[PDB]
Amino acid sequence: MDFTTDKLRSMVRKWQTLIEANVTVKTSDDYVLRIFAIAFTRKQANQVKRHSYAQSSHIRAIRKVISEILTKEVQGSTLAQLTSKLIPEVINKEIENATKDIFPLQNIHVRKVKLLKQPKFDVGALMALHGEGSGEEKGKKV
Amino acid sequence: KGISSSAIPYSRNAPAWFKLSSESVIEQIVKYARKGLTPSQIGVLLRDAHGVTQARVITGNKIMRILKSNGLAPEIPEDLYYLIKKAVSVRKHLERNRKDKDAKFRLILIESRIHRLARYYRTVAVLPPNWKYE
């Protein structure tokens, strides 16, 4: 999975910090995934100072809880479960709820998921991801 | 340079809520010193938990004089001891990894500061002359 470049260029603004993290996690299958994360420091409503920077220990703590809870969302998922988890953007809601104790953090995203190794084939698992099928087909008519 | 020190009150009395004894404070002082704390640690523990404000006010005299008159004198003053052990910690760091030029510079600074007050303490003769920092 990957963002387009225009999305994160449309997200990056000066006078904030981008906290980005990544973890290399092996799922409940033997797929190992490098999964990324980006998050940008919001300013609160009634904030009058123009900066809203994080104090870099808040960055280390935010990046710590990002790594912990998204490596908890993997290992507790298969590939199909993780894919159905990151279609409706809900790991981002988990990061936002787990991190609003530290900094506000607008538009957290996952932004990038890379396969590194894949276990075996398991045609049965693939056909259970899709649906069944077997053919006896036509016969020659002589 | 910053101005961050402690502001000693104008009073020189016990604060009139200090109902403890002027001798039980000394017994607590020598107990903490014999279990092994530096006099600054005695003063901060006595201030934080058994609320003597400062013991030059509440006891008779200051607590290094209390320790020396109760037999718990230091081998070397606390300033020199802490600067000595900081210098030897930086020296062991430097023997471990030898590309830390900044820590070499801080060792030159710490060694200069060692020599300054070692010279002061030597001309006062708190510690004996022919003392070298090894």
Add this chain to the structure above:
RNA sequence: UGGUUCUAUUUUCUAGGACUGAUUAAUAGGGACGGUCGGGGGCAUCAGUAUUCAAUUGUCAGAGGUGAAAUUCUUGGAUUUAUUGAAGACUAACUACUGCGAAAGCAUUUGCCAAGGACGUUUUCAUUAAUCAAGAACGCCGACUAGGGAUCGGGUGGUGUUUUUUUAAUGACCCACUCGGCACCUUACGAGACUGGGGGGAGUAUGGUCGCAAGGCUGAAACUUAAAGGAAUUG
């Protein structure tokens, strides 16, 4: 720790003797502690996508590059596309009249190693201090008054919103105060007394000295001399 002997009910309590004796605590200085702070340093680790190279496909005639071209590569498949590997760097945007460092300088993650600063302090020492020739390491001014807005680090108080709950502690913002920084915008008031050098700027003249420079068709001079060329050319 050792030793001697004095009082009344089998063991109770007792008295004596030998191995310290001036101040503060500098809006001076140092040291400890505490929660921290930073792109300060060292080691290790982790990642990123470019680039270069290689392997494998796909397709076919050009690709670079330039103001145009060219050297170069290319039907033994270049360039483009897709998958993957290897290498050496580098740390994009975030990135600032922001931060840290004694300066040169320092920007990916995580950990270790020591360090440092500011703040907080009813902790400690007690003049331990300031400046620099020598030497060592690394490589509109000042002795001067007040302010103002913004920002970075710490602290105190307020009492609203984001937070939230019986797992630990821990935020973010708003406001006032305060300490310390990088700057900026102003104010008031002061004698502030890798070494070697001719003499202003812009010009003008030159019967001096030192130079460089003209002539005149070449050939071609001792030779009025060939070929060929030049020049001008409505034979």
